[PDB]
Write a protein that binds this ligand. Structure first.
Ligand SMILES: *Cc1cc2c(cc1C)nc1c(=O)[nH]c(=O)nc-1n2C[C@H](O)[C@H](O)[C@H](O)COP(=O)(O)OP(=O)(O)OC[C@H]1O[C@@H](n2cnc3c(N)ncnc32)[C@H](O)[C@@H]1O
Ligand SMILES: *Cc1cc2c(cc1C)nc1c(=O)[nH]c(=O)nc-1n2C[C@H](O)[C@H](O)[C@H](O)COP(=O)(O)OP(=O)(O)OC[C@H]1O[C@@H](n2cnc3c(N)ncnc32)[C@H](O)[C@@H]1O
Lengths: 576, 576, 52, 104
C-alpha cells in the first residue's frame, strides 16, 4: 500500500472495472478496494460458471448464486414455534435474532434484494443479458437535441458492448432456441419482433460458452507487469471502505477511510479522484455514513445538508416468471422434414431427410442433428439432441409492450428444481416491468442498528407505485400468460407468479442522475460527479434515474464511460 | 505438458496432495491431473470457507456445498405429473431423463452419494474432523503383533495430523462448546469421555478460523519456484483421466490416457509410477474402464481376469441427525456467576462478577465475555455473546458405544438452520455408525450408460447388512435421542432421523486393502500397490476394508504416507 | 377428514405472515389487521393454538 | 404403529382461559383467549423425560416412520383441557368453583 494514488475506486464489480480500464489505460495511478475476496480462479473476478463442470451440470449453479447473495434487509421474524419441548429455552417476544432488522416494515420491503461481496461483484454469477435501452427507458445526456442525444448513447453503448463482448450469435445453432424463435416470430406477424437476447459471452465450442464478467472489462492483475509495463494498478481485496471525508465547504473529498479486514488495521487513503462503485445499496450506505443525505429514519423536519435526493426515488422492476413444457405440436415439428420407417430399437428402423429441399421447414444442420440423435439413440422419445444449447429469445421493450422479455434458460437464485419433466421441453419466461421513480420510495440507513461489517443497516420503504406502474405489471403478467401459451402449457411447480420484490436485483435510482440537482431531484450530474464536489464520482445502476424494464448494467457501464471522459478532461495523471 | 514424468497423480484432493508433498519433496518429477478447475482463491485447492464474508454469513456456505455435490447414481424418475396442459408434450413411459441411470434399482441405492470435481476436491468444502480409528475400526498393518501395529499407526497418524494441522483446542474458549462439553462430561462421568472434535484447522483470530484443505497438505504451486528451486511439480486442471493402459502381461502400467477438456485433445502420458487418488467412486470407475474387475451388471458366471473384489465389500456409514434447542436450565447457568442490579434498559443496570471467586462455576474468560455481552446488549434476552464460536464436542467410538459422535455446528449439504429460533441456542447432533463389509454390497459400472464425461455410469447395489450393522444403527438412534435430551429438546423441523443413504460421504471399501488378494478379498496390498502390477498405486477411502464409524480421511492419508515410503525405496527420481 | 371438519379453533392469533408477491394491482394490507376471525387479544406465544 | 404419550400438567394460577369484553366469536359470545405455558419444574422435566421414553420404547418395536418423527404436538391439539371451573371441598382454600357434587 501507497498512502497516495491518482484515482481510488471502491468495488471491483463490472462498473469499477470500467473506470479501471479507462483510467489505468490512460496512465492514471489507480488503486481499487473490495470488501470481498478473490475466490473465482486464476482469472481474477471471472465468471464462476466458466467451468466445464458447471456447464455440464448447469442446475447446480443455482446454488453457487444463492451462496453469495446476502439479503439487504430482513424484518424481525414473527413465525410462531409452539412445539418446542417445555425444557427448551422459549422466547417471550419476537426479539431481534439472526441479523434481522427491527427498522424494517415487513410490508414495505424489497425482501428479495441482496448483495454480493467478492472480487468482481455480481458479474461473477450474472446471466449476462446486455440490451440497450430505447429512448423511453433512457436518461437524457443532451436535452432539446434528440439526434445529438442518440449519437452520444450509440457511441457509449457501442464501447460498452466491446468491453463486455456483447453479441447476439452465440446461440444461433441451438434447435430449442430456433424452434421457439421462429414460432413466436410467425405468431406475432410483425406486430412484435424477436431476436436473440444480447449476451456478454463468447462461445468457445459447441458445449462451452465463456460468459463475460468484470475480468472481461479489466483483468484485475497488478500493474506494471510484463504485459503492461507502463500502467499502474493495484487491487486490495478484503478492505471495507467506510467513508469519504469531506472538506469543510463540501466542495472536495480529502480522503477515503478504510478498514483492512485481515490485519484489522485502518488507514486514510489519499487520491486526486475518488470513485464509488460499490453497488446501488452500498454506494448509498457509504455516502450516508460520510455525512451525505440523512442518517436514520426519514425526518422532513431536519432536511439534510447535502444531497437531499440521496436514497429517494428508488426503482426496482416487477418480475413475473414461469416455465413451460413444449407443445406436442412443436416437438413433432422438430422432425417435420424426416422420413421415419419401422420401429425404434429394431435394425430395420430408419430416419432420413432430403438435403437442400426448398420445402424443408428446417435447415440441413438441424435435420442432420435430429437424424443422428434419433438414429443413435432409439430409446429416446424426443427428437432434440441431449446437448442442444438453451434458447435465448427476447422481444425487446416497446411502448405498446413496455416490459423486457426473456424466453430462455439460465441459472438464477430460483427456477425449477424438478426432475420428472425432461429438461429439453422446459422454457423459462421472465418479464420485467418498469417502475416510476417516486419520492416516497426510499433506501435509508439506521442510526442505531448495524450490518455484519458494522455499518448503518440498510432499510427499504418501498411499494410499486399505483397508476401506470401497477397497470403495466398486471398487463405484463397477462402478456406472459398469453404469449407462453403459443409454445406450451405451464410446468407444474413453476406457475405464473410475481417474484419476491427485489429478487430481480435491478435496483436503480438510489443516487440518481439528472441535469439540475434541485429541479431534477438528483445526486449526480451527467458526468456522474456528485453536485458540489470537484473530485467525487458515482457509478452503477444507482445513477439511472428513469423507469426502465431492460437489464440495466450495460446502461450503467455507458454512463461510467462518459464519466471517465470528464475525468480525462479535468485531472492529470502523475508521471510514471 | 511433458509427455514423461517420474510420477503422475490423478486427483488433487487431500490424498493426492499427500503423495505430492511426499514425492515432490523427495525429488521426483511429478505431474498431477484433475478433471476439475482452480476456483477457490489464489491459494490453490484451499478451503472455500476461509473468507471473511463466509465466516460472517456461515449459513450461506451450505449453498456452496450443494453447488459442488453432483449425485453419483440417480434412478429413473417415476413421479406422476398429470397436471400438464393437454397441449404440452406428455410422456407415455418413465423413460430416461435428465441424467438418470436406468440400471439403478432405487431401493438398493446410496442415493445421497455425490462427488465433487474441482481442484482440491472435497477438501475445498469439508468440515475438517480428523479423528484416529481405534483398533476395532482399523485395518491391520502388521500381522500377529498388536503392539507393533499400534506403533506403526501412531507414527503414520502423527505425520498425517501434522500435514492437516490437526488440533483439539481451536474452540476451547467457546462458551457454547464448554457449556455442552461440561454438561455431558458430568452426565457420563466414569462412563464415557468427551473432548473437542480433532479438527484440521488453525485459529487466526477470535472470529476467524483457517480451515485446512488439500492446500494445507501441499500448496499446489508449479515447481521449480523461488521457494523450491529444486523441486518439480506441475498441476494440470480440467483434464479427464480415462484409462490406465495395462501391458498385455498385466504386470505394469504403460501409460495414462487423458482428455484435455479445454482443447478437446486426447494424449497418452508416460510415467514411472502411477497413483490414482480420484476418490472412492472414481478411482474404481477409472480401473474398471481400464480392464480391471468386470464391466457391467455383475455376472459371477464370469469371473473377471483382474481384481475380482474391485467394487465389492463396499461400506457406507448409517448417519443419524437432529438438532436441539438449548434447555432453559443450561442457558440460565451461563450467567450463574453474575451479580445483577435492577433491570435492563433502566438507569442503574449493572452486571458484575468476581474473578477468582471459589463459588464461581465458570472461568474468568467465560464470565468476562458474558458480563460484556449483557452490558453492551441490554435488549438481548440471552447471555451468550453474538460471535461465540461454535460448539465442537465428541465422545469417540468405543465397544460399548460403537458409533462416532459430533455435537457441534458446521456447514453440510443438509441441516441449514431456520430463522425463528436464535442460532445461539441450536446444536447439531450427528452420530455415524459402522458398516460390515459384505461381498454383495457393490459399486459397479454400466457397460452402456455413461455419465456426463462419457465414462461408464456408476450404479450401487447396497443395503445395510442385517445383524450387527442394523441393530447397532438403531441403538445409535436411541443413544442420540437419550444423549441429546440432556442438553435440550428437538428443534421442530430437525427431528431425529436417518439421513439418506450415502449423504454422509464416507464411502469405503471400493478398492480395498489387505495382505493377500485372495484370502482377504482385496485389490491393494499394505503399500497400497495393486496386486500384480509393479507401478500402480491407489489412495483414498476406498482402500479401507473395515467397518468404521469415525470420519475416514485421516486414516486414508496415513495409508498414503505408508504408500509413499514404498515408492521412495523402489523407484529412482530422474536427474534434475 | 371428518374430525378436522368439526374442530373449530378456539383462539387464533392475528396472522403476521408476509405475503409480498401479490400483483401490484391487487389490494394490499398496510397492517396485520383483524382478518378472518382471528383474536387480537391473543399473544401467539402463550396460546393453546390447537385447542378446538 | 402410532405412539402417543400424555403428560400431566401442574395447575397454576397464572395459566388462564379468559374472555374479551370487546371481541366476540361466531356466535356473538365473548371471544375466548388463553394465557398458558407449561409450568417450569416438574411438568417440563416430566414432559422431556416422556419424549425420551417414547424414543426408547418405540425402538423395541421398530424405527420411526419418515414423516412421523417424534415430536411434541401443537399445544392443546390433544384436547384434554381441564380445570377451567375446578372442583374442590372449599372455594377459597382449594381455589375452586364447584364442590364435589359439582354445585357452584
Ligand atoms: C445475481 C445476478 C445479477 C444479475 C443477473 C443474474 C443474477 C443471479 N443477471 C444480469 C443480467 O443478465 N444482466 C443485467 O444487466 N444484470 C444482471 N444482474 C445484475 C448485475 O450483476 C449488476 O447490475 C452489476 O454487477 C452491477 O455492477 P456494479 O459494478 O455496480 O456492482 P457489483 O457487481 O455489485 O459490485 C460492487 C462491489 O463492491 C463491493 N463493495 C460493496 N461495498 C463495499 C465497500 N463498502 N467497500 C469496498 N467494496 C465494497 C463488493 O464486494 C462488490 O464486488
Ligand atoms: C462434502 C463433505 C466432505 C466431508 C465433510 C463434509 C462435507 C460436506 N466432512 C469431513 C470431515 O469432517 N472429516 C472427514 O474425514 N471427511 C469429511 N468429508 C469427506 C472428505 O472430504 C473426503 O473424504 C476427502 O476429501 C477424500 O479425499 P480424496 O483426495 O480421496 O478425494 P476427493 O477429495 O474426492 O478428490 C478426488 C479428486 O479427483 C478428481 N477426479 C475424479 N475423477 C477424475 C478423473 N477421472 N480424472 C482426473 N481427476 C479426477 C476430482 O475432480 C477431485 O478433486
Amino acid at each position: 500500500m501507497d498512502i497516495k494514488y491518482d484515482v481510488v475506486i471502491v468495488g471491483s464489480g463490472p462498473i469499477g472495472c470500467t473506470y479501471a480500464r479507462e483510467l489505468v489505460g490512460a496512465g492514471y495511478k489507480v488503486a481499487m478496494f473490495d470488501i470481498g475476496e478473490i475466490d473465482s480462479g486464476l482469472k481474477i473476478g471471472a465468471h464462476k460458471k466458466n467451468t466445464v463442470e458447471y456447464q455440464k451440470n448447469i442446475d447446480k449453479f443455482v446454488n453457487v448464486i444463492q451462496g453469495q447473495l446476502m439479503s439487504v434487509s430482513v424484518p424481525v421474524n414473527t413465525l410462531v414455534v409452539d412445539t418446542l419441548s417445555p425444557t427448551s429455552w422459549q422466547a417471550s417476544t419476537f426479539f431481534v435474532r439472526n441479523g434481522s432488522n427491527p427498522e424494517q416494515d415487513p410490508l414495505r420491503n424489497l425482501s428479495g434484494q441482496a448483495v454480493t461481496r467478492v472480487v468482481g461483484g455480481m458479474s461473477t454469477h450474472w446471466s449476462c443479458a446486455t440490451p440497450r435501452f430505447d429512448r423511453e427507458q433512457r436518461p437524457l445526456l443532451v436535452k432539446d437535441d434528440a439526434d445529438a442525444d442518440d449519437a452520444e448513447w450509440d457511441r457509449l453503448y457501442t464501447k460498452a458492448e466491446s468491453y463486455f463482448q456483447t453479441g447476439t450469435d452465440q446461440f444461433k445453432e441451438s434447435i430449442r432456441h430456433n424452434l421457439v424463435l421462429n414460432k413466436l416470430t410467425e405468431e406475432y406477424k410483425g406486430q412484435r419482433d424477436f431476436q436473440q437476447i444480447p449476451l456478454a459471452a463468447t462461445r468457445r465450442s459447441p458445449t462451452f460458452v465463456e460468459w463475460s464478467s468484470a475480468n472481461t472489462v479489466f483483468d484485475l492483475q497488478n500493474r506494471p507487469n510484463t504485459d503492461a509495463p507502463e500502467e499502474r494498478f493495484n487491487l486490495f481485496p478484503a478492505v471495507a471502505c467506510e467513508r469519504v471525508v469531506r472538506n469543510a465547504l463540501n466542495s472536495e473529498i480529502e480522503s477515503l477511510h478504510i478498514h483492512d479486514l485481515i490485519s484489522g488495521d485502518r488507514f486514510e487513503i489519499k487520491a486526486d479522484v475518488y470513485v464509488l462503485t460499490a453497488g446501488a445499496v452500498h454506494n448509498t450506505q457509504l455516502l450516508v455514513n460520510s455525512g451525505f443525505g440523512q442518517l436514520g429514519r426519514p425526518n422532513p423536519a431536519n432536511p439534510p445538508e447535502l444531497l437531499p435526493s440521496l436514497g429517494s426515488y428508488i426503482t426496482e422492476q416487477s418480475l413475473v416468471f414461469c416455465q413451460t413444457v413444449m407443445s406436442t405440436e412443436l416437438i413433432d415439428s422438430v422432425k417435420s422434414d424426416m422420413t421415419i420407417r419401422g420401429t425404434p430399437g429394431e435394425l430395420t428402423y430408419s430416419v432420413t431427410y432430403t438435403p437442400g429441399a426448398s420445402t424443408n421447414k428446417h435447415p440441413d444442420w438441424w435435420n442432420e442433428k435430429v437424424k443422428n440423435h434419433m438414429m443413435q439413440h432409439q430409446e429416446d422419445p424426443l427428437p432434440i439432441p441431449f446437448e442442444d444449447p438453451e434458447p435465448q429469445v427476447t422481444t425487446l421493450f416497446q411502448p405498446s409492450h413496455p416490459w423486457h422479455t426473456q424466453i430462455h434458460r439460465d441459472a438464477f437464485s430460483y427456477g425449477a428444481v424438478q426432475q420428472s419433466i425432461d429438461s429439453r421441453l422446459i422454457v423459462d419466461w421472465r418479464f420485467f416491468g418498469r417502475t416510476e421513480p417516486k419520492e416516497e420510495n426510499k433506501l435509508w440507513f439506521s442510526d442505531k442498528i448495524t450490518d455484519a461489517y458494522n455499518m448503518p443497516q440498510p432499510t427499504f420503504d418501498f411499494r410499486f407505485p399505483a397508476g401506470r406502474t401497477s397497470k403495466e405489471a398486471e398487463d405484463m403478467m397477462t402478456d406472459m400468460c398469453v404469449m407462453s401459451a403459443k409454445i406450451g402449457g405451464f410446468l407444474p411447480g413453476s406457475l405464473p407468479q410475481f417474484m419476491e420484490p427485489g429478487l430481480v436485483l435491478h435496483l436503480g435510482g438510489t443516487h440518481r442522475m439528472g441535469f439540475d440537482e434541485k429541479e431534477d431531484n438528483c445526486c449526480v450530474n451527467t458526468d456522474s460527479r456528485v453536485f458540489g464536489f470537484k473530485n467525487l464520482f458515482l457509478g452503477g445502476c444507482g445513477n439511472i434515474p428513469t423507469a426502465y424494464g431492460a437489464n440495466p448494467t450495460l446502461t450503467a457501464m455507458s454512463l461510467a464511460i462518459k464519466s471517465c471522459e470528464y475525468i480525462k478532461q479535468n485531472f492529470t495523471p502523475s508521471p510514471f
